[PDB]
Amino acid sequence: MDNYFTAITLLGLRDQNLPPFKDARLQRYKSIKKMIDLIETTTKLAPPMPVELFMLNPTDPEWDDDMTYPTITH
């Protein structure tokens, strides 16, 4: 059950209540099936950005020192 908040929002559970009978209720679940595939596809079209923006490259030879943490044994 991924895209939980998206599915709950598409079903209208943020503003109304589902029909109390299983027939119309279970049809409403299957009705957002197309929209989930659309919203899933939209979120996979993001353009890339430099990875060296908020994260130093961990494979840089500078970090081969393998330095430890100096501590005080209080």
Partner 1 sequence: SNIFLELQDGDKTVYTHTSLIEESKQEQIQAIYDKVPQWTNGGRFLGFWLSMEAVNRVQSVAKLPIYYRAGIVATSTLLGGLVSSLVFWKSGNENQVAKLANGAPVYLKKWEVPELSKLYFFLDDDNNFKPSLNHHAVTQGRQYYKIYQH
DSSP state of 42: H
Residue 22 has which token pair?
């299983």
The yes or no reply on residue 66 touching partner 1 (CB under 8 A) is no
Residue 12: HSE in the Cβ half-sphere, 13 Å Cα cutoff: 8
**Region from 6-14, 28-36, 37-45, 54-62 binding partner 1, contact rule CB under 8 A:** 54-62
The one among 53, 64, 68, 70 contacting partner 1 by CB under 8 A: 64
Q: How many residues touch partner 1 (CB under 8 A)?
A: 4
CA distance 51 to 15: 40
Residues contributing to the site for partner 1 (CB under 8 A):
60-62, 64
